[PDB]
Every structure is written in C-alpha cells, then in structure tokens.
Amino acid sequence: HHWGYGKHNGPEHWHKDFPIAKGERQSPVDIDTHTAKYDPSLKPLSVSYDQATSLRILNNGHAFNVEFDDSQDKAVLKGGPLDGTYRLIQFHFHWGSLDGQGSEHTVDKKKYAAELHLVHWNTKYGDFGKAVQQPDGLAVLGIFLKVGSAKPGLQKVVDVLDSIKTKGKSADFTNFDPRGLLPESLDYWTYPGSLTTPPLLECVTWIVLKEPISVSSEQVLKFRKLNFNGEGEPEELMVDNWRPAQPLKNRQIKASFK
Numbered sequence: 001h002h003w004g005y006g007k008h009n010g011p012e013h014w015h016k017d018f019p020i021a022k023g024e025r026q027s028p029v030d031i032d033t034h035t036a037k038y039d040p041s042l043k044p045l046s047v048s049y050d051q052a053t054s055l056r057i058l059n060n061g062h063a064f065n066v067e068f069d070d071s072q073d074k075a076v077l078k079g080g081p082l083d084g085t086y087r088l089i090q091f092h093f094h095w096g097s098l099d100g101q102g103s104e105h106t107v108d109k110k111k112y113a114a115e116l117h118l119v120h121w122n123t124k125y126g127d128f129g130k131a132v133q134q135p136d137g138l139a140v141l142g143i144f145l146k147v148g149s150a151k152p153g154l155q156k157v158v159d160v161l162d163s164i165k166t167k168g169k170s171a172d173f174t175n176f177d178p179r180g181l182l183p184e185s186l187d188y189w190t191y192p193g194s195l196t197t198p199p200l201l202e203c204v205t206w207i208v209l210k211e212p213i214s215v216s217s218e219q220v221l222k223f224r225k226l227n228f229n230g231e232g233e234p235e236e237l238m239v240d241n242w243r244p245a246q247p248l249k250n251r252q253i254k255a256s257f258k
C-alpha cells in the first residue's frame with residue numbers, strides 16, 4: 001500500500017513499487033574510515049544561513065519537516081564538492097526507539113541515536129521539481145546526533161512537537177535559525193547517492209559531517225512521542241523511521257580531512 005517503516009511495508013518492500021531501490025547509487029551507506037580517500041582538492045564548505053526564513057513545521061507521517069522560503073537566495077550552500085548554488089528548502093530528522101540506533105549513515109558500523117538532514121536544490125534548474133530530474137539536482141547536509149548534554153538550539157523544535165503530533169498537522173514556525181544546529185567543525189565525507197525514502201531518486205550529492213552534535217535524553221525522548229497515524233486512527237509511535245545501509249557498489253567516499 002502506501003510506503004512505511006513497519007513489518008509489511010518497510011524498506012525491504014519498497015523495491016516492489018520503486019524499482020530504483022536496487023540501483024547503483026542508493027543511500028544510506030556505512031562509512032568505513034580507513035577506506036575513504038582523503039582528497040585535498042576538495043574545497044571548504046560555505047554555509048550562508050544568515051538570511052534564512054523559516055515558514056512552518058509539519059508532520060507528514062514519515063517524519064517532521066521545517067520548511068523555509070526558497071523563492072530567493074536567502075540561505076545557501078556552496079563550496080565543498082559542489083558546483084553552483086544550492087537553496088535550502090527544508091530539514092528533517094531520522095531517529096530510533098532506543099539510544100543505540102536511529103541514524104541512517106553509520107561510521108565503522110557504529111549507529112548514532114539520530115540524524116539531521118538539511119535539504120538543498122540546484123538553482124541552475126529553476127525549481128525543486130526540475131532539480132529532482134538531474135544527477136546533481138540536490139545536496140543534503142547530514143549531521144549525526146548522540147545522547148549526552150542538551151543542545152540549546154534544538155529546544156525551540158522540541159517545544160512545538162505537541163501541536164503537530166499526528167499526520168497532516170502543521171504549525172507556524174517563523175524566525176528559526178538553522179545555524180544553531182551546526183557542530184564546531186565543518187569537516188566532512190562526501191559521495192554521490194539518492195533520497196533515503198521513496199521515490200528514492202538518484203539526484204543527491206551527500207555531505208556527511210564528521211563531528212556529531214549532542215542532545216539530551218529528554219530532548220530525543222520527545223521525538224519518540226510523535227505519531228505515524230493521523231487523528232482518530234489507532235496510535236502508532238513514530239520511531240525507527242530509518243533505512244538500513246545499502247551496498248556501496250562502484251563508488252568512493254572522499255574525505256576533506258586527514
């Protein structure tokens with residue numbers, strides 16, 4: 001039926017309606033530290049989120065998305081492995097039912113408690129819809145979350161979750177600064193891949209940051225209170241909305257550090 005993360009319609013079943021699930025550049029992948037090739041030609045990332053305008057937040061049944069106004073070059077990403085300018089359109093998380101699982105990408109087989117994705121599209125293409133039809137259409141910045149001390153800048157998001165508990169609900173979310181979710185260093189690993197949920201299109205340049213941000217037990221606990229179901233249906237806790245690591249096949253992961 002419509003895709004999900006449960007026993008009967010989870011990741012292992014997606015290939016039935018989305019054949020691309022067995023493609024050559026699928027995500028996510030495990031990052032083997034000793035095999036990633038340090039590439040010194042890679043340039044440093046350029047994150048310009050000072051003029052970012054958040055609009056709303058909404059539960060879509062798979063995760064929650066904070067949307068931003070992408071009609072002009074307000075919050076952009078360039079540099080690193082990129083060619084051209086990429087506009088931020090939205091961010092979301094992937095998390096688990098226990099502290100030792102939740103991230104999509106792994107490092108030396110290690111699983112973190114969750115993972116943040118900041119989605120951007122190539123301005124060359126005009127709009128998001130066109131960008132998803134190109135090999136270099138999207139650029140997603142990935143950040144790992146580990147359980148420890150509380151992240152001040154995450155709290156604003158934690159507070160509003162009660163108002164978007166079930167599928168379809170949305171709430172205004174203006175004046176949020178995404179710069180409060182970044183770790184100290186911008187060191188990364190990069191590889192060519194795809195969306196981690198259907199339609200599983202292969203249009204993404206993945207940029208996974210080395211340094212994870214830490215959040216509190218209580219902060220992630222509130223993530224686990226959301227619901228997959230819409231209002232009035234039986235309650236199914238929104239947890240473990242992550243895709244298992246896919247085979248790397250004929251690709252290479254480059255690192256911007258040694």
Ligand SMILES: NS(=O)(=O)c1c(F)cccc1F
Pocket residue numbers: 117118119140194195196197198
């Ligand atoms: N999770 S993900 O980053 O790959 C992702 C996006 F960025 C955008 C749409 C769907 C989706 F699944």
Ligand SMILES: [Hg+2]
Pocket residue numbers: 131132133134135137201202203204
């Ligand atoms: Hg594509």
Ligand SMILES: [Zn+2]
Pocket residue numbers: 092093094117196
């Ligand atoms: Zn994602």
